[PDB]
Each structure stands twice: as structure tokens, then as C-alpha cells.
Amino acid sequence: SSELDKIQSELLNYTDDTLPAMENVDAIKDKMSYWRRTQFAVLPMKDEAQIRQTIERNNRVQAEINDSLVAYGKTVWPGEEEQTFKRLMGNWNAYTAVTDQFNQTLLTQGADDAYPILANSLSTFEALESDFTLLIGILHQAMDSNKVQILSSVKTLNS
Ligand SMILES: NCCCC[C@@H](N)C(=O)O
Numbered sequence: 001s002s003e004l005d006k007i008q009s010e011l012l013n014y015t016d017d018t019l020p021a022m023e024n025v026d027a028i029k030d031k032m033s034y035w036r037r038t039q040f041a042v043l044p045m046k047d048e049a050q051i052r053q054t055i056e057r058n059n060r061v062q063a064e065i066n067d068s069l070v071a072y073g074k075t076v077w078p079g080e081e082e083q084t085f086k087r088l089m090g091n092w093n094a095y096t097a098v099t100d101q102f103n104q105t106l107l108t109q110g111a112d113d114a115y116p117i118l119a120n121s122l123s124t125f126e127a128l129e130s131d132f133t134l135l136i137g138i139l140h141q142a143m144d145s146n147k148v149q150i151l152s153s154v155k156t157l158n159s
Helices: 002-041 048-073 080-108 111-120 122-156
Strands: none
Touching: 002 048, 002 122, 048 080, 080 111, 080 122, 111 122
16 A cells, blocks of 8 residues: 555656646746747837837736746755755846846837847846756656656556
């Protein structure tokens, strides 16, 4: 019975913890990348109302990413995931500080003065990108470790 409970607990961990975590981080990263793209798409814009509308929309998307990250942080496991996510959050705070300055300059001075904020803060943004990519790798590893253990336990049952 302790054998079956081991397999059932590892299946549950895989299906209800690991896979959701991976699906969620994948989706946050895709959203952040789209969000980043939108910050460059607002610069060629010429109508001020269209510019403000896009910034308001992107701030909503920023708040969704942030809420998703805060929610994810409550679930992180000690070790590589916690340390990686702690760093990711620091770089997220950094880039949203850049983004606040970018939005403010775009709306009060124009795209020509706002673009350099993006062009010159690449170290800040790539650090955030890199952390997402490391976190996804941790979860990819967890997915594979889960599978290996599930398969191994099917053996112990003598099945
Ligand atoms: N906080 C998310 C953790 C997901 C991976 C974890 N369930 C593991 O088996 O390693």
C-alpha cells in the first residue's frame, strides 16, 4: 500500500503541481514577451489618444504579469526554484521601474525621447528574460524528474 501511495503521490505532484507550474510560467513568459513587443509598437504611433490607449492597455498587461508572478512566488519550492524566482522578481521590479520611466517620458515628451530608455536598458531587460528562461528550465527538469520517478515506481510494483 505504501508502494501504491508513493506512485499516486508522484502522479499527483506531476499532474497537479509540476505541469500547472510549467504551463503557467510558459504563459507568463509569452505574455511578458508580447508586452515587451507592445512597448516598441507604441513608438511609431502618431495620435496621442492612440498612444495613451496603448499605454493604459499595456499597464493592464503589466499588472496581470505581476499578479501572476506574485501568485507563483507563493508556491516556489526551496532551492534552485526559490533562489531563481527571487532573482527574477528583483529584475522584474527593475524593469517595471524602467517601464514606468518609459511610459512617463513617452506621454510627456514623445517617442523620440522615450525610445532611448528601452535601447539603453537592455542589460536590465535581458536579466529578466534570462531568469524566466532559467525558471522554465528548472520546471522542464522537474517534469522529467517526475516522469522518471513515476516510471521507476511502476517497476517496483512488479508491473
Ligand atoms: N512551485 C512549483 C514546483 C513545481 C515542481 C515540483 N512539483 C517538483 O516536483 O519538482
